RNA sequence: AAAAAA
RNA sequence: AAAAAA
RNA sequence: AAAAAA
């Protein structure tokens, strides 16, 4: 009797939940100092100037981790007013220390912007900071600039248009985490096909069209470093957070992060999917029960995180392995196995892992082959229908 | 009837928890001295160079046990700012003596450190402890270094390079616990496949891959003293209770526990997870019961340490022969032989002990060969699908 | 960790 | 009092 | 004590 519920007790220590409160003492490692250009005035031109300098910059081969994930969050909180204030809020990490910088505008230099917080005779940090290489020498190729050529710069006075701008360019960049961290090279027509789609939502204009290499070098720079996901992410949970209305930014990004939530638990909602909706007689076989528990138990301590639970694997934290597979290779592999053929979407996508049986593949298949019409005993006796019309054309 | 309860009294006196209260008096034998060159300044130059120096050392055939295993400490405890404040909580142990000692940089000797607790005017006990011999004489392979021959100095200067380097480094010296007590010679492919994992986690990079030799010494040391272990130990252990964010390295190090809880506790888990979890009608069996209630009291005493229990056998403790199967070896090779036919990746696990009885592990595996196919009773009837559709294929 | 998801 | 028990 | 476990 009290065996099982020992048993259960046991089961849900291993995976207990690490929340908040005190213990543990207080850790930190060293800290970078990025600079982010944040835009002091909440004029338009100005940020409209900003974010074609930045852009101009951000696709240049040579560029520095730092500058260049600096340069990524400026770019990304730059839609609210007064962004210092949001980075502030939001900024909550001890991986790199944000040094905020104002910005204004200016009509005595090239890149036509100085910094507000260092000094208004600092002009020439400016123009060092934003445009100094841009393949002049090595690798011409290097540099990255919109698909159309005509569009020599993004620099707008209307403020639709650099509102539509910000928007399409803050989708662009979002987008990149459905498969950043998962398979990143392999996530070209996943966004090419998220672009052609906004843009007939009438919310973007393709004009604003990027080249690839700057969207894969900004992959790549975002899941180099964490720090980046995770402020991205902490703008998501407070954006999915905001109680009244949403502007048009916030829900265009509160639309995309459906496509970032779950970006590497497939291998767990594809399997609770297969394997516990479809509610199939494997299931209750003897060789399943341990991973049906280990499953209701990952569940549950998802359920019990909050918020932030979907974006385990962007964070890249450590409790995503307890999620992986390799506790239930067998209902996994199962799962997998049945949605190859009920699905029918999941043929290229790879799960050949060191812990697969294709036993259990070839098992869920033929068990799917032969139940294409084979019509449960619940919803038959719920409905109470017989099998004769299931059978008719299978 | 008080007969089962008179029992059930004296079985769980037999494996009375340990708890601390204060009786016992205490006793302590002798403690070594054992140097850490803890960096005093929180640069990160003079961090890359200890570290270099320190690698550089550590590779060398012709050391010293207590040196070395100083050396390695050293190296674990140097993300954290000011090491010394956190190797002051973590050690309480009395099996040596942490002497701390803080260090600087130099630009007048060959090393280029000195110790500052000592004095400014000794330098030449840095070089004489950082570089005295390194394969001149007697064995020239005897010293280690890193596969990459071009890398003659691992000396970084940029925070994030020093920052993957110190975090590299430490995953490979934390990967190693996962065997290092339990079969070390035979943990070779294990860490190179953990390193081949890690680095396409964008965590780390290969090109800080050591030489065989470096990791063997390094885990026979580990397993020769047990001080290292317990402030390993210890060390997992206040990272896991930090309430808060925890930094890369810190999550590194959460995540490598992983492999390291249970290292030796096979023999526990797996018999848990196959003669417990599954349910099977030989459970039943009269002669189980006692192996039953054994491993009840087991995982209870387990559940009842704290922390510090899965660790139990890289402690090496005294308790760790509790959780062997000596007092359940029936149960034990029937839950092996069933994992040997379920698992189907335990074989190359070695079990062949002086108490192995291959009568109950033919037994298991015939009813695991028999019971392919057979759906119980308590899923069965909480579903209430029939075995028909599960012995289609068996 | 790997597909799809106005 | 009589074996085994990382 | 002995395997696997993004």
Redesign the interface.
Known sequence: AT?LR??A??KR?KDRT?????????????K?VIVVPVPGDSSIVTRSRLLDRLVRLAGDPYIS??KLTGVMISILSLFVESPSQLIQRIT????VSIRLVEVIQSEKSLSGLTFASRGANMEDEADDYFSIQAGEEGDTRGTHWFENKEIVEIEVQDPEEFNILLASILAQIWILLAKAVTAPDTAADSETRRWIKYTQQRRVVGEFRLDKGWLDAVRNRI??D?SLRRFMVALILDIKRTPGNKPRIAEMICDIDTYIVEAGLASFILTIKFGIET?Y???????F??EL?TVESLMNLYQQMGETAPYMVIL???IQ??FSAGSYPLLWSYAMGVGVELENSMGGLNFGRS?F?PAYFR?GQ??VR?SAGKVS??LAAELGITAEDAKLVS
């Open positions: 065996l020992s048993l007790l046991f220590n690490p929340l908040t409160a005190g213990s543990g003492g207080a850790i930190r490692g060293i970078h981790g730092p909550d990490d001890p991986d899941a180099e964490l509610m007689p494997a299931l209750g076989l003897h060789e029960s341990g528990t890249e934290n450590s392995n307890k812990y049986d098992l033929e068990m032969r005993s619940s």
